[PDB]
């Protein structure tokens, strides 16, 4: 959720060029609006090795 | 006798060939010494938590505390592996799993793992909530962070950091990763029981971090003090998330709680192309069937700021809401049959409550559809709990699939003000009401309990009061 | 600033900054570029300079670094790691006895 606060920084980025990126419309939905609590703030490391095993 | 008594349970660790018995059989030989470990160990530990052995093992001349320090330093990999064990039991750490990297490790020390004693059989939220929500106690002196208090300054003193400094740098694989996360345990563990005095000086490291930034030592030596550091760090991240929910009956609850308490406190446009685009990439519409559509778009169409079925009045979006409510429909068995072990489960039912939430707002429009759902999960209930006389046995079907995770469907729905009230026109409170008087049903009244939401008034703390009265003993146990 | 700031609370600042001094040690020696070096040095002599406390246990590493750059066989460098020492014999009383000859 560290990220939440860049939205207003991209989000008049894209609304000037009309950019409209299917994976990073999934990501900024599941910030604004909640989605899980384990999943938001974790490490990437033990995500990555999770997948891996 | 003053150092030669009490020691002599010392001796197991501290000598490297130790033979208690003069005559004995060379055929378990090995697995004396095992065993010998094994009551050595119960014997360390019993004499450091009563206070007439914790004086006379630190006493500030010669003690046997030292030479259990002194005898880590030493590259031994039989003594140091035993030893290890002894710490951790010492300060009641939980132990890790034995592996080369520190992630794997790292993964298995969270407070938020899974335990065997959360499952619906057993406690299903109070077990669970007890080791995740911290205590309601802020004043009162806890004893035991006392003893432990003591405990730990006794070690530093001796220079038990300096010892486990060398165990890391100076160590096989396996050991080292071991040694480091007990490093991070202790740091972390005496920054909030040790007073300041005592700790403003142990969150350095002056031996460790001399060895790090030091090119005249091998390197081989250099980047393993560094790559020390580093795997300490992200420990640190560990104890800064804290426990976090592993069961989405649990979740709910503490997403709703913090919601009613930052709402006292007084995005895009979504044109029509931005769903079209979307909805086609959804995979829902060209093919009807399951496990091929794209569940992440599926989700985000549904919580978007904007698309509430009311503001964007289209046909193919009506197609669309009908195409997904076919999936979810408890009659319609295509997702109640679907296994617990689905590896997505967690995504399907989130996307469940996610999709209940969204006919819900279009009170005008989406009731028509919400209406459907609804019906059916009642009469799901009246089969699947038996009051009908006819089955009374759909117990094993409930708790091997999916059809359990529908009290959140219904749950979800008594947080808003419209939602209680659709749920008298679809009289699902009276279902629920009936059933508390089940002697044989116990797991299906563990699920009503924790999936209403009692923060306003109404019928919903009716039938919490009727179930912690009127139930079976065990039952009004749990409630 | 989270010098100062780290003296308040150890507990957040000190695990970063650890990472955080050796990759400013880390340029000095294995960048061979006199800018990126001029850089590394002005950083540390802030760090040392606002949080004396801290630094005075790492006297042996960072000193040992700086007197290997001055006997290196650019104006920008000189500049700042004489300054740097200027504040390491300050925080080290009568501890820099053994490198004044």
Same mark, same amino acid.
């Given at each position: 959720?560290?990220?939440?606060?860049?939205?207003?920084?991209?989000?008049?980025?894209?609304?000037?060029?009309?950019?409209?990126?299917?994976?990073?419309?999934?990501?900024?939905?599941?910030?604004?609006?909640?989605?899980?609590?384990?999943?938001?703030?974790?490490?990437?490391?033990?995500?990555?090795?999770?997948?891996?095993? | 006798?003053?150092?030669?008594?009490?020691?002599?349970?010392?001796?197991?660790?501290?000598?490297?060939?130790?033979?208690?018995?003069?005559?004995?059989?060379?055929?378990?030989?090995?697995?004396?010494?095992?065993?010998?470990?094994?009551?050595?160990?119960?014997?360390?530990?019993?004499?450091?938590?009563?206070?007439?052995?914790?004086?006379?093992?630190?006493?500030?001349?010669?003690?046997?505390?030292?030479?259990?320090?002194?005898?880590?330093?030493?590259?031994?990999?039989?003594?140091?592996?035993?030893?290890?064990?002894?710490?951790?039991?010492?300060?009641?750490?939980?132990?890790?799993?034995?592996?080369?990297?520190? $992630?794997?490790?790292?993964?298995?020390?969270?407070?938020?793992?899974?335990?065997?004693?959360?499952?619906?059989?057993?406690?299903?939220?109070?077990?669970?909530?007890?080791?995740?929500?911290?205590?309601?106690?802020?004043?009162?002196?806890?004893?035991?962070?006392?003893?432990?208090?003591? $405990?730990?300054?006794?070690?530093?003193?001796?220079?038990?950091?300096?010892?486990?400094?060398?165990?890391?740098?100076?160590?096989?694989?396996?050991?080292?990763?071991?040694?480091?996360?007990?490093?991070?345990?202790?740091?972390?563990?005496?920054?909030?029981?040790?007073?300041?005095?005592?700790?403003?000086?142990? &969150?350095?490291?002056?031996?460790?971090?001399?060895?790090?930034?030091?090119?005249?030592?091998?390197?081989?030596?250099?980047?393993?003090?560094?790559?020390?550091?580093?795997?300490?760090?992200?420990?640190?991240?560990?104890?800064?998330?804290?426990?976090?929910?592993?069961?989405?009956?649990?979740?709910?609850?503490?997403?709703?709680?913090?919601? @009613?308490?930052?709402?006292?406190?007084?995005?895009?446009?979504?044109?029509?192309?931005?769903?079209?685009?979307?909805?086609?990439?959804?995979?829902?519409?060209?093919?009807?069937?399951?496990?091929?559509?794209?569940?992440?778009?599926?989700?985000?169409?549904?919580?978007?700021?904007?698309?509430?079925?009311?503001?964007?009045?289209?046909?193919?979006? &009506?197609?669309?809401?009908?195409?997904?409510?076919?999936?979810?429909?408890?009659?319609?068995?295509?997702?109640?049959?679907?296994?617990?072990?689905?590896?997505?489960?967690?995504?399907?039912?989130?996307?469940?409550?996610?999709? @209940?939430?969204?006919?819900?707002?279009?009170?005008?429009?989406?009731?028509?559809?919400?209406?459907?759902?609804?019906?059916?999960?009642?009469?799901?209930?009246?089969?699947?709990?038996?009051?009908?006389?006819?089955?009374?046995?759909?117990?094993?079907?409930?708790?091997?699939?999916?059809?359990?995770?529908?009290?959140?469907?219904?749950? @979800?729905?008594?947080? &808003?003000?419209?939602?209680?009230?659709?749920?008298?026109?679809?009289?699902?409170?009276?279902?629920?009401?009936?059933?508390?008087?089940?002697?044989?049903?116990?797991?299906?009244?563990?699920?009503?309990?924790?999936?209403?939401?009692?923060?306003?008034?109404?019928?919903?703390?009716?039938?919490?009061?009727? $179930?912690?009265?009127?139930?079976?003993?065990?039952?009004?146990?749990?409630? | 600033?989270?010098?100062?700031?780290?003296?308040?609370?150890?507990?957040?600042?000190?695990?970063?900054?650890?990472?955080?001094?050796?990759?400013?040690?880390?340029?000095?020696?294995?960048?061979?570029?006199?800018?990126?070096?001029?850089?590394?040095?002005?950083?540390?002599?802030?760090?040392?300079?606002?949080?004396?406390?801290?630094?005075?246990?790492?006297?042996?590493?960072?000193?040992?670094?700086?007197?290997?750059?001055?006997?290196?066989?650019?104006?920008?460098?000189?500049?700042?790691?004489?300054?740097?020492?200027?504040?390491?014999?300050?925080?080290?009383?009568?501890?820099?006895?053994?490198?004044?000859?």
């Amino acid at each position: 959720k560290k990220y939440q606060i860049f939205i207003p920084m991209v989000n008049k980025v894209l609304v000037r060029h009309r950019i409209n990126h299917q994976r990073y419309d999934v990501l900024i939905c599941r910030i604004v609006k909640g989605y899980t609590l384990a999943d938001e703030e974790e490490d990437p490391l033990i995500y990555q090795h999770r997948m891996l095993r | 006798r003053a150092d030669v008594e009490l020691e002599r349970i010392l001796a197991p660790y501290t000598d490297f060939h130790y033979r208690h018995s003069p005559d004995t059989a060379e055929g378990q030989l090995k697995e004396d010494r095992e065993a010998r470990f094994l009551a050595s160990k119960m014997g360390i530990i019993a004499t450091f938590r009563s206070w007439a052995g914790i004086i006379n093992l630190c006493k500030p001349g010669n003690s046997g505390i030292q030479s259990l320090i002194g005898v880590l330093c030493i590259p031994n990999m039989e003594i140091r592996r035993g030893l290890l064990e002894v710490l951790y039991d010492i300060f009641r750490l939980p132990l890790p799993v034995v592996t080369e990297e520190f $992630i794997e490790a790292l993964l298995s020390v969270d407070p938020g793992r899974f335990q065997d004693s959360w499952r619906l059989s057993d406690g299903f939220v109070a077990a669970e909530a007890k080791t995740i929500l911290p205590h309601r106690a802020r004043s009162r002196p806890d004893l035991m962070d006392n003893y432990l208090a003591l $405990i730990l300054s006794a070690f530093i003193r001796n220079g038990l950091l300096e010892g486990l400094v060398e165990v890391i740098t100076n160590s096989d694989d396996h050991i080292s990763v071991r040694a480091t996360i007990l490093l991070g345990e202790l740091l972390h563990m005496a920054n909030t029981i040790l007073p300041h005095s005592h700790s403003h000086h142990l &969150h350095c490291l002056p031996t460790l971090m001399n060895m790090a930034a030091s090119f005249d030592i091998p390197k081989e030596k250099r980047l393993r003090a560094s790559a020390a550091l580093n795997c300490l760090k992200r420990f640190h991240e560990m104890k800064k998330r804290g426990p976090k929910p592993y069961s989405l009956h649990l979740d709910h609850i503490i997403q709703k709680a913090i919601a @009613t308490h930052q709402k006292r406190d007084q995005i895009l446009k979504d044109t029509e192309e931005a769903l079209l685009i979307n909805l086609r990439d959804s995979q829902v519409l060209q093919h009807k069937e399951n496990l091929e559509w794209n569940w992440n778009l599926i989700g985000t169409i549904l919580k978007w700021p904007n698309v509430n079925l009311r503001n964007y009045k289209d046909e193919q979006l &009506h197609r669309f809401v009908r195409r997904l409510l076919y999936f979810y429909k408890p009659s319609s068995k295509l997702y109640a049959n679907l296994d617990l072990d689905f590896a997505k489960a967690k995504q399907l039912t989130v996307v469940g409550c996610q999709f @209940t939430e969204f006919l819900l707002e279009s009170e005008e429009d989406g009731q028509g559809y919400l209406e459907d759902l609804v019906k059916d999960i009642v009469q799901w209930l009246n089969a699947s709990s038996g009051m009908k006389p006819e089955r009374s046995l759909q117990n094993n079907g409930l708790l091997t699939t999916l059809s359990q995770h529908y009290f959140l469907f219904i749950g @979800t729905l008594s947080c &808003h003000p419209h939602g209680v009230k659709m749920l008298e026109k679809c009289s699902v409170f009276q279902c629920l009401l009936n059933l508390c008087s089940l002697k044989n049903q116990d797991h299906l009244l563990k699920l009503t309990v924790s999936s209403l939401d009692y923060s306003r008034d109404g019928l919903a703390r009716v039938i919490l009061s009727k $179930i912690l009265t009127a139930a079976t003993d065990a039952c009004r146990l749990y409630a | 600033t989270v010098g100062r700031l780290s003296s308040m609370n150890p507990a957040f600042v000190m695990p970063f900054l650890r990472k955080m001094l050796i990759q400013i040690l880390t340029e000095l020696e294995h960048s061979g570029i006199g800018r990126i070096k001029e850089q590394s040095a002005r950083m540390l002599g802030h760090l040392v300079s606002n949080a004396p406390r801290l630094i005075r246990p790492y006297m042996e590493p960072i000193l040992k670094a700086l007197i290997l750059k001055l006997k290196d066989p650019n104006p920008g460098v000189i500049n700042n790691v004489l300054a740097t020492i200027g504040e390491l014999a300050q925080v080290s009383g009568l501890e820099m006895r053994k490198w004044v000859d």
